[PDB]
Every structure is written in structure tokens, then in C-alpha cells.
From a paper:
The pro-oncogenic cellular activities of [name] alpha (ERα) drive breast cancer pathogenesis.
We also solved structures with the WT LBD for those molecules with no existing structures (LA-Deg, LA-Stab, RU39411) or were able to solve to improved resolution (RAL). (A) Superposition of each monomer in the asymmetric unit of WT (green) or Y537S (cyan) ERα LBD in complex with RAL. For WT cells: GDC0927, RAL, and OP1074 showed the most potent transcriptional inhibition at IC50 = 0.03 ± 0.08, 0.11 ± 0.08, and 0.14 ± 0.05 nM respectively, compared to 0.35 ± 0.06 nM for fulvestrant. Overall, these structures present canonical ERα LBD homodimers with 2–4 monomers in the asymmetric unit.
Residue numbers in the entry:
A (entry chain A): 307 to 461, 464 to 550
B (entry chain B): 306 to 337, 340 to 461, 467 to 546
The structure:
């Protein structure tokens, strides 16, 4: 993994991209605002399975222990859902494209108590992507950075010092990769550094939205909010029988 | 105008703007639970010095008062935390809230819900330590937190463009520092990225800290709009 070129890094990330899923309901029937959370929950749950298989294709990720793979996904899963949402919504001002058949605006967000504030933050992030003219190759680098970065500070065993050093090396490679993309695009050295910072600073906002969103989901008092250790392990820990 | 400062002038302005290190307010002859009262009192006194510092960050006072207040509302606990982490850098295993208030994680356990965030703060300090973070870099990072934390949640696009122009100059300033220190272009990029990724962790800690503070049902957690505006002293 640490021997990939920038071009190989981009290529592997582009190839790992998960599909765009649809909301599960009959589109010949009228839409009901009262079904919204149900629809969003079912969508998130199905997306999680594809997220696990995307994560396994992120260079350097399966080199980690399964325990650490689980912890990174525990920390990052809602951030990853959210940056994916923002990316899908970038070309639809004022809207959030949860699915091609589930395109919502903030007035619809208002029907769920406590949701509109987060809605508004997601919309502003989509606006920022648009203002920056964020490219696909840049987007997949950012999403991989979220996966590797978000949980790396909340995990001192010898094996684990080895894990953190590996993560930091892979992160350095993704930085090189972003710079390569920007250079190949024709940006000056000054413009490369400035845009690199602009991209990375957005990740602080994505982390903020993830924490506000998590607090919001917990406030709904559903039985199931986060993916369990066991659920994630089961999905991550495949046998070699297939 | 602020946008015309050189990288060297930006660094000097930020170093000179640095706030003082305050002490905890307690009688050291008296027996030492009341931990939260001490920390609350400390943070409350730190805030006015934070406002004086923000007014000295180049470009900040070119914003409307309304927008200055919004930025401080968003950033104040992050700023207190990166300050704590910086002060704690040479004290492995402990958090230097003040020179007369140096606590370890065992003392953090005495307050329900605190030790998890305590541990995150200690880890961030260790990361700064291992990166050999310099004072010149620290004051750039802290200025970035002030300008960046609220910029995605706001004439208004003129204000945002201004903020992003100032952020760009601080990026330029960070790179300049690293170049003078003899880092290669590759190392310059990589170090900039490593520093900015730590800011996501600091945002995370601020979020969890805020939840914790709210979970204690205290008199009040966030500084009000009116308090901040008053301290800005129009
Ligand atoms: O609405 C959701 C959402 C709903 C349920 C979720 O989790 C359901 C619990 N489930 C339990 C098993 C493990 C996986 C999660 C997650 C997101 C989405 C979001 C959200 C927005 C605002 C807010 O205040 C809270 C969340 S963002 C998002 C992106 C998606 O691709 C899908 C759903 C979503
Ligand atoms: O303990 C505090 C703290 C206590 C009270 C605070 O706010 C009190 C409310 N006050 C109201 C008027 C405006 C200012 C805030 C803020 C921080 C500090 C921190 C903390 C750590 C862990 C955790 O779970 C929660 C907080 S971090 C910190 C750094 C400081 O320089 C000072 C206090 C602190």
C-alpha cells in the first residue's frame, strides 16, 4: 500500500466507489412526510453494507487489525454518510439528494423535530463544495482521509504504535496524491497549498455535523442508533470461504 | 489593510497578540470535587483575554461585529482546548489547566463523564509533542480555528470571501515557516496536512466537551451573544 504512486492511489479510490442507492418505497404512491425518518433509516442501513466493502478497498485499511478497522468505522460512519450526501447534493442548490428518489429541502427537514439545523449545515457544505468546484478525484481522497483520520486519535500497545504510524504514512500518501492532482490541473505551488488547506478545513465542519447529527439521532430514542461492534465485526470479518 | 502583510509580519502580529496564562482561583493553603467550579471560573476569566486576542488577529476586526460574535460563539471552546493542549505539551500524562492546576487522568475520573475527553486532550498533546510543534505554528493554527469554525454557518459573501482570503494568508504563512526551517516541498505539504487534520480532532473534542458541560445541568454553558458583543467593545 505504501508503494502506490499518486496515480495508483487515485485509481484505486475511484474504483472502490460504492453505488448510489435508492430509497425503498412505491414511487406511484404519494410521498408522506411522516414516513421520512423510516425512509432515511432504511437507506442508511443499506448504505452501511456498501461502506464496509468500500473501506476494505481503501489502500492500507485492511493492513490494520480487524479491531482497529472496527474502531475507525465506529468513529467515521456518519461522517462518511454525510460527505457522500453532500457530494450527491452539490449540483442541486438548496436540496439534499439522499437518494435519486429522495430529494429533500429544508422545509421538509422541518417536519422532523431537531433536523433543520443539521439540514442547514449540510446544505452550506454542499454550497462550499460548489464554490470550490470540488472534483471527483479530490472527493474520494477526502472521504478516505475521513476514514483513516477520524478515529486515529481515540486509539497504546506496541501493535498500536505500529498501527498509528502506518495510518500516518498512508495519510501522507493521500496528501501527496491531492497535491499531484492539483499540480496536474495547472495550479501554482501557492494555489496548491491554499487549496489543500481549504479542502482539509472542510473536514472539521464535517466532523461537527457528524457529532450534531449523532446527538440528534440519540434524541429520538430508537432502539438502534450506532452500528454495534459485533455488527461491524461480522461485516468486516468475512471468512475466506467464497 | 491586513491582506498586505508579509508572512513575517503575520507571524510577528500573531506572536505579539498572544494572551496571558491565567491562574486558578483558590487558596493553596486550603485543602483541595470543587474541580468543576475552579475550571468554570478559569474559563470565564480566560474568555475576555480571548476576545482581546481575536481583535489582534489580522483581518478579524474588518468583519461586522455581528460576524465577529458568530465566529467567537463557534470557536471559543476549541480555542480554550488548543491552548490547554499547547500548555500541556511538556507535561506528559497531565493537563496544565493553569500553572497551579496541573491534573492527571485520575483526577479527571472524579468528575463523571470527563475522563474520555481528558484522554483525548492528553493524546492531542502527545501528538503535538511528537510533531515538535513550534510556537509560530501554534499561533497560526489557533487563528485558523477562530476564522474557520464558524465560517460555514453564517455583504455575507463579501465577509466569507474576506475570511477565506485571511485563511489563505495563514496557510501561506505556515508554509513559509516550514520552508525557512529547511523542509522539502513534499515535507511542507505533508506537515501542513498533518496539522490541519489535528483541527478536526480539536473540533471533535469541543463537541464532546460541550455535550458534557450541557450534561452537567449548570447555570449556563455558552457565552451569550450580548456578552461577546459587549466584550468586543464596539
Ligand atoms: O437521516 C439520516 C440517518 C438516519 C438514520 C441513521 O441511522 C439509523 C440507525 N442505523 C442502525 C444500524 C447501523 C446503521 C445506522 C443514520 C442517518 C441521515 C442523515 C442525517 C441528517 C440530519 C440529521 O439531523 C441526522 C441524520 S445524513 C444521511 C446520509 C445518508 O446517505 C443516509 C442517511 C442520512
Ligand atoms: O473544564 C473546562 C470548562 C469548564 C467550564 C466551561 O464553561 C463554563 C461556562 N462559561 C459561561 C460564560 C462564558 C464562558 C463559559 C468551559 C470549560 C475546560 C475544559 C474541559 C475539558 C474536558 C471536558 O469534558 C469539558 C471541559 S478544557 C479547558 C481549557 C481551559 O483553558 C479552561 C477550562 C477548560
Amino acid at each position: 500500500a505504501l508503494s502506490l504512486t499518486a496515480d495508483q492511489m487515485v485509481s484505486a479510490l475511484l474504483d472502490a466507489e460504492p453505488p448510489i442507492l435508492y430509497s425503498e418505497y412505491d414511487p406511484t404512491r404519494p410521498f408522506s412526510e411522516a414516513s421520512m425518518m423510516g425512509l432515511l433509516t432504511n437507506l442508511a442501513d443499506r448504505e452501511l453494507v456498501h461502506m464496509i466493502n468500500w473501506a476494505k478497498r481503501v489502500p492500507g485499511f485492511v493492513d490494520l487489525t480487524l479491531h482497529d478497522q472496527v474502531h475507525l468505522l465506529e468513529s467515521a460512519w456518519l461522517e462518511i454518510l454525510m460527505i457522500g450526501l453532500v457530494w450527491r447534493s452539490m449540483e442541486h442548490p438548496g436540496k439534499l439528494l439522499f437518494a435519486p428518489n429522495l430529494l429533500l429541502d429544508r422545509n421538509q427537514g422541518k417536519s422532523v423535530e431537531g433536523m433543520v439545523e443539521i439540514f442547514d449545515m449540510l446544505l452550506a457544505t454542499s454550497s462550499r463544495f460548489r464554490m470550490m468546484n470540488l472534483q471527483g478525484e479530490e472527493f474520494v481522497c477526502l472521504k478516505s482521509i475521513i476514514l483513516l483520520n477520524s478515529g486515529v486519535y481515540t486509539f497504546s500497545t506496541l501493535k498500536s504504535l505500529e498501527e498509528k504510524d502506518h495510518i500516518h504514512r498512508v495519510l501522507d500518501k493521500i496528501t501527496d496524491t491531492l497535491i499531484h492532482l492539483m499540480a496536474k490541473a495547472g495550479l501554482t505551488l501557492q494555489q496548491q497549498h491554499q487549496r489543500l488547506a481549504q479542502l482539509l478545513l472542510i473536514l472539521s465542519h464535517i466532523r461537527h455535523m457528524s457529532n450534531k447529527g449523532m446527538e440528534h439521532l440519540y434524541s429520538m430514542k430508537s432502539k438502534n442508533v450506532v452500528p454495534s461492534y459485533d455488527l461491524l465485526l461480522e461485516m468486516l470479518d468475512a471468512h475466506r470461504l467464497h
